[PDB]
Write a protein that binds this ligand. Structure first.
Ligand SMILES: CCC(=O)c1c[nH]c(C(=O)OC)c1
Length: 103
């Protein structure tokens, strides 16, 4: 559980990141046309936060799966040169970097 301690570390670092603004809260399908249709399994940092505090992560691979899901959804719905897309690539590279330099 140096595992789940690190998950707390990297989640907090992601939550406080400059490019984290599109992923702090769940996407509002009422405000974003087509998101409900295109993204099957929505995921964000607050949802990951809620599950983490309540100990809902069996292990670190489950945590990583949700994090990558956030960035997979981002690249699926948003253009790479869009403001959200650009922020997503920064966050995705940040996660993979910090995650790997530990594991
Ligand atoms: C219309 C705004 C929009 O397309 C959008 C807002 N948030 C996202 C998103 O995918 O953030 C995760 C897309």
């Amino acid at each position: 559980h140096s595992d789940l301690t690190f998950c707390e570390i990297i989640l907090m670092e992601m939550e406080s990141h400059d490019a984290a603004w599109p992923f702090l809260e769940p996407v509002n399908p009422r405000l974003v046309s087509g998101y409900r249709r295109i993204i099957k399994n929505p995921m964000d940092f607050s949802t990951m936060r809620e599950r983490l505090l309540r100990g809902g992560y069996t292990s670190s691979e489950e945590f990583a799966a949700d994090a990558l899901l956030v960035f997979d959804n981002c690249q699926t719905f948003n253009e790479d040169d869009s403001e959200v897309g650009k922020a997503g690539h920064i966050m995705r590279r940040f996660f993979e970097s910090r995650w790997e330099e530990f594991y």
